[PDB]
Design a protein around this ligand. Structure first.
Ligand SMILES: NC(=O)c1ccc[n+]([C@@H]2O[C@H](COP(=O)([O-])OP(=O)(O)OC[C@H]3O[C@@H](n4cnc5c(N)ncnc54)[C@H](O)[C@@H]3O)[C@@H](O)[C@H]2O)c1
Ligand SMILES: NC(=O)c1ccc[n+]([C@@H]2O[C@H](COP(=O)([O-])OP(=O)(O)OC[C@H]3O[C@@H](n4cnc5c(N)ncnc54)[C@H](O)[C@@H]3O)[C@@H](O)[C@H]2O)c1
Ligand SMILES: [Mg+2]
Ligand SMILES: [Mg+2]
Lengths: 342, 342
């Protein structure tokens, strides 16, 4: 009784998704699809997949899978989610959700009308350390949260591993900040208003590589989301998100090296919140790679129980709005209203 | 020959100024003034000052001093500076400079018109660790700065040492934020626009005790100034201002315990930017206390040479505007133009 999945987009990151599908219990991959025959062969051979397609339409016409995992680039997300809805196939879609908030909304409305589950593969909130911060905060250990910082500052050459990122007129917020904004929603709740600034430092890219964002949360909390790929430190933190939360009765400080510090009324604890290094994982991306298992296992459990997933399409609109709002704000110079976009 | 100072306002912080005046070379205190005779007697007896005045008008009528050190609370600042200008006595004025930017400008104008120096006693930038950040950045070690964070988050009970701070409609930006803003100007230069948010967490004060401020610096740098007196940490950092600066070729990290990490094209340097401990100083105020001597020696040196001071009245208008702009931004939710205010 394993769920049979089809994966569409056998790119670099899909390799991680395929390994994790292997580990996931109650689901496995019965078919793959990619436009590039060399990627289709590499992944099909690596993972022992007999069913191989050069195009998604043909895959969907043949059928015989219970869900679809869409790990293509953003251009094809809307069409592939629409094809899944039309064939009543529950769907997972990689980030970014779509090219616009407008496209993402329509994709959500189509999967609601087809009565199928739609999950965005937004895995940063599923990292072990981020989950731990969530659990501490939910316990009431530090009372009500009023302030936060969510920070990802790196000097890591990500432009080798994928050199199209150096090409877009937009870069760090769409590629990385999207995750940091999602973490900030996950911890501190939905955002009412957003103000952002962006800067290009690296002479060799088109897009912005520094973004500083100020979030007014609906629950009254204020937070800072700062991201950078132009930050040159003496020990490289890639790809760790560092988090500070202040509450009425204490603080949470998740610092470099997965160190989790919690001060409350009953003193102060320090714990290790680092990931399990999986058999197929690789330092220092083992953080991100564990989260792939966590989120796919979450999808699979929720597909059996019939519950809404945590980064459902509907939920992810509220993250996606913050990406579009930040680009709008940085160009305008203006604070953007989030509720008026949704 | 030693310059003779008169100090006006023999309150809790003036005690530090009087110790420091002793240690200053080329200057000493020859008269004191306080409206409260208990304080006049306590400070007069502690420092062996024979000339003692119940009111500043009579002090200025007798004369016999080359400069005046105004350590009163804000209400009386403008009058006392005006009295100093009319009597052609060079003046030091405590922060906050005045009640409004408007009063502050009039104070600058009267001192200019009377051809007397006027310095705001703004001592945080004269702290050894802050000076060391400045020196590192000016040496070129990390390239052009593009981003900064200036942070003072504490749970220290400042309300005991001075109970009026609990009373006012405003608190943390006027009292402390003013310093953090000055440091941000000192390191990253003058500010073009400002956006600010405030909150009251502590249920036993009337004023705001949390503020988060986003600065667009004239030179294109972005910074966060974030201050809190409702942050409960495992180690109390009071009263350290923690600083992060990202540049095009490196980074500066001034972290708790006065540790200074600098990374550049060569590698990483770690230094100890701890303050000295003067003979009369007490932990944990010793850093602030050292900076009192530094700024008062700076005054004395500049008065003797003919030069202008670093935190002059003219200069401090650009710090003070940020305070006033922050309260305005926080009320309207609007970004505020600093250039327009000056
Ligand atoms: N933390 C994360 O979850 C994470 C990490 C990296 C990348 N991503 C995201 O995952 C997605 C894929 O990233 P990647 O780095 O693997 O890109 P990639 O270019 O390596 O992979 C995309 C693959 O999809 C194929 N493809 C494109 N359009 C297609 C279509 N219409 N039908 C079938 N196949 C198609 C391409 O041939 C390619 O092999 C992107 O949206 C990216 O933003 C997410
Ligand atoms: N880091 C710093 O530089 C620092 C630290 C603490 C306080 N301060 C500033 O120093 C100032 C004083 O703070 P404080 O805590 O010492 O206040 P305080 O209330 O302890 O002292 C003020 C004194 O001035 C007297 N006074 C008031 N008006 C007067 C007048 N017209 N003439 C003569 N005396 C008068 C009062 O009787 C009192 O003794 C404030 O403006 C505060 O912002 C600066
Ligand atoms: Mg499996
Ligand atoms: Mg002396």
């Amino acid at each position: 009784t394993e769920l049979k999945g089809a994966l569409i987009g056998c790119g670099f990151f899909a390799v991680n998704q395929m390994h994790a599908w292997k580990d996931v219990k109650g689901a496995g991959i019965a078919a793959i699809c990619d436009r590039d025959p060399k990627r289709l062969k590499l992944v099909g051979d690596q993972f022992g997949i007999e069913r191989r397609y050069g195009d998604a339409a043909a895959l969907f016409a043949d059928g015989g899978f219970d869900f679809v995992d869409i790990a293509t680039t953003v251009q094809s997300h809307r069409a592939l989610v629409e094809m899944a809805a039309a064939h009543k196939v529950p769907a997972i879609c990689q980030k970014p959700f779509a090219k616009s908030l407008s496209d993402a909304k329509a994709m959500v409305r189509t999967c609601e009308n087809a009565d199928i589950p739609l999950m965005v593969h937004e895995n940063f909130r599923w990292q072990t350390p981020i989950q731990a911060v969530k659990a501490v905060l939910e316990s009431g250990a530090i009372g009500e949260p009023f302030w936060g910082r969510f920070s990802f500052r790196s000097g890591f050459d990500v432009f080798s591993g994928q050199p199209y990122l150096a090409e877009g007129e937009r870069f760090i917020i769409e590629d990385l900040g999207i995750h940091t904004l999602d973490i900030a929603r996950f911890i501190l709740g939905d955002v009412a208003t957003l103000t952002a600034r962006t800067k290009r430092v690296n002479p060799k890219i088109k897009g912005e590589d520094v973004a500083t964002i100020l979030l007014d949360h609906q629950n009254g909390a204020t937070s800072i989301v700062d991201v950078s790929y132009a930050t040159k430190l003496g020990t490289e933190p890639f790809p760790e998100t560092l988090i500070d939360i202040d509450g009425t009765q204490g603080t949470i400080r998740l610092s470099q090296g997965y160190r989790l510090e919690v001060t409350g009324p009953n003193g102060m604890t320090i714990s290790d919140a680092s990931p399990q290094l999986l058999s197929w994982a690789s330092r220092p991306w083992h953080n991100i790679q564990e989260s792939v298992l966590a989120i796919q296992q979450h999808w699979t459990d929720r597909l059996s129980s019939g519950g809404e997933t945590s980064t459902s399409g509907a939920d992810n609109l509220k993250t996606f709005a913050l990406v579009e709002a930040a680009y709008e704000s940085a160009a305008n110079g203006r604070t953007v209203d989030i509720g008026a976009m949704l």
